[PDB]
Design a protein around this ligand. Structure first.
Ligand SMILES: Cc1ncccc1N[C@H](C)CS(C)(=O)=O
Length: 103
């Protein structure tokens, strides 16, 4: 149980983070030229939240893979000095730090 209890804590903390604004909703491929072609597996916090709320995470490791996918996608599509990239680096360091705090 407490495995998925912490996932809720960490997800809510990412959701409310100052740097979370790029990752709150799915990227809109109609607005982001090239996104569909380059990113094979989109992921974002609201999709993780939908999946966490109706039970679809078997372990904490499934949840972490989705979190890391958000930031791997961010680094694949966005330059490191771009505004989305800088936000994603903050969010990625936040997630890894908070996740290791725990396990
Ligand atoms: C996470 C990400 N990655 C690549 C470009 C943009 C983004 N974030 C945007 C906020 C998504 S939007 C609303 O479609 O423009």
């Amino acid at each position: 149980h407490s495995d998925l209890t912490f996932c809720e804590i960490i997800l809510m903390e990412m959701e409310s983070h100052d740097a979370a604004w790029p990752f709150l909703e799915p990227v809109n491929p109609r607005l982001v030229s090239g996104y569909r072609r380059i990113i094979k597996n989109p992921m974002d916090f609201s999709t993780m939240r939908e999946r966490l709320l109706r039970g679809g995470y078997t372990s904490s490791e499934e949840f972490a893979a989705d979190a890391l996918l958000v930031f791997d996608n961010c680094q694949t599509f966005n330059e490191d000095d771009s505004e989305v990239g800088k936000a994603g680096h903050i969010m990625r360091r936040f997630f890894e730090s908070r996740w290791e705090e725990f396990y």
